[PDB]
Write a structure and sequence with these properties.
Layout lengths: L3 H16 L4 H16 L7 H4 L7 H13 L3 H8 L1 H9 L7 H9 L5 H6 L6 H8 L1 H4 L3 E2 H18 L4 E4 L1 H4 L4 E2 L2 E6 L13 H11 L3 E7 L3 E6 L13 E7 L5 H9 L2 H14 L1 E3 L4 E3 L15 H7 L13
Helix pairs in contact: 1-2, 6-7, 11-13
Bound molecules: 2'-deoxyguanosine-5'-diphosphate, calcium ion (CA) (3 copies), chloride ion (9 copies) and sodium ion (4 copies).
The structure holds 3 DNA strands.
DNA sequence: CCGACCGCGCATCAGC
DNA sequence: GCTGATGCGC
DNA sequence: GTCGG
């Protein structure tokens, strides 16, 4: 909230380029500019001041000078008044509708939540589920509920096999008072990078959580990534709990630390961390960190014993999850 | 004054 | 079936 | 849109 006006302004322009113009690199440019302004420890006074930061160029500095002088931005006033632009934006908020499908619907005259429910035969399984819980998925999750959900997941995993290990990540791990959804990192001695000694390791766990009626729906599912829906049990004659998005990612036991770093985030922290890695000569994904060659290829993975080891390779002071909250 | 931009899981489509 | 691309998501 | 090749 230090420079809250500017970073809100740029986040709004970022969404317009992603969802309407389908310019993903203009989207990423606006998120970078808003995120560096957010870490800047002063109240900004001019476009020429902001231009000194990396990722603010001539055009964004001219927009900050308009906003500080007038309290508004004209380009965002036209965007906000364009019906077609604003319909396309709203549609992408449904799980499973992106910019491509949102523009095709709007070109076909489908432009409200009522229009969607009337045209359910134009939607795939994913989009239909995202429409079903649309209001529920717009809601935050209090840390007190995340606590109960974690107790249920850890207890049932232990009943399947006591050698599984499950860890709640995402914004919860970063200490947030509320989260957007629940993210679970899972490992088992039988799935390593070297060998898969047992079948259906992820399937076995989804199944047990379905049979005690914790998981309620599947958006997508493979051998390592599950994307779906879940719900806490309610008491007699109390309002049910909102349904919630859940993601479970099975990672090889020996690559747990790269995996838990990716899964803890945030998204723009990850993006900035991997960009810095590149200018230091490495590449980071959720499995490994590797160095790059003169060709550009990645070499063999480097040993890792902790989250801190990865910050060390790229020469970063360690950051506890609560300070990765960009 | 043009050409790249973090990295990948799952579902589906074109050309073969 | 496969590549390689599009689309949507973490 | 920005930065760097
Ligand atoms: N490299 C990279 N990592 C990402 C990206 N999006 C998400 N991740 C990671 C960081 C997130 O904390 C984690 C879970 O996704 P999320 O639930 O949308 O984020 P969150 O609100 O819990 O932080 O996935 C992404 O776009 N790029
Ligand atoms: Ca998530
Ligand atoms: Ca989350
Ligand atoms: Ca995100
Ligand atoms: Cl772009
Ligand atoms: Cl307005
Ligand atoms: Cl009608
Ligand atoms: Cl809320
Ligand atoms: Cl389902
Ligand atoms: Cl399900
Ligand atoms: Cl798979
Ligand atoms: Cl890898
Ligand atoms: Cl670049
Ligand atoms: Na700059
Ligand atoms: Na309008
Ligand atoms: Na969406
Ligand atoms: Na992709």
């Amino acid at each position: 909230t230090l420079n809250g006006g500017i970073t809100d302004m740029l986040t709004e322009l970022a969404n317009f380029e992603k969802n309407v113009s389908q310019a993903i690199h203009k989207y990423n440019a606006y998120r970078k500019a808003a995120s560096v302004i957010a870490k800047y420890p002063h109240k900004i006074k001019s476009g020429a001041e902001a231009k000194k930061l990396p990722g603010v160029g001539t055009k964004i500095a001219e927009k900050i000078d308009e906003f500080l002088a007038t309290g508004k931005l004209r380009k965002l006033e036209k965007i906000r008044q364009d019906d077609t632009s604003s319909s396309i934006n709203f549609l992408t908020r449904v799980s499973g509708i992106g910019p491509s499908a949102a523009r095709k619907f709007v070109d076909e005259g489908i432009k409200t939540l009522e229009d969607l429910r009337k045209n359910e035969d134009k939607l795939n399984h994913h989009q239909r589920i995202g429409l079903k819980y649309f209001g529920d998925f717009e809601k935050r999750i209090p840390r007190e509920e995340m606590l109960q959900m974690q107790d249920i997941v850890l207890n049932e995993v232990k009943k399947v096999d006591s050698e599984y290990i499950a860890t709640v990540c995402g914004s919860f791990r970063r200490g947030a008072e509320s989260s957007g959804d629940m993210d679970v990192l899972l490992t088992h001695p039988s799935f390593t990078s070297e060998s898969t000694k047992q079948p259906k390791l992820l399937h076995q766990v989804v199944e047990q959580l379905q049979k005690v009626h914790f998981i309620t729906d599947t958006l997508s599912k493979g051998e390592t990534k599950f994307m779906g829906v879940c719900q806490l049990p309610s008491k007699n004659d109390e309002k049910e709990y909102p349904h919630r998005r859940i993601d479970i990612r099975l990672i090889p036991k020996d690559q747990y630390y790269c995996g838990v770093l990716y899964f803890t985030g945030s998204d723009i922290f990850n993006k900035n961390m991997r960009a810095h890695a590149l200018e230091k000569g490495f590449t980071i994904n959720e499995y490994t960190i590797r160095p790059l060659g003169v060709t550009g290829v990645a070499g063999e993975p480097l040993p890792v014993d902790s989250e801190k080891d990865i910050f060390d390779y790229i020469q970063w002071k360690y950051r506890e999850p609560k300070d990765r909250s960009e």
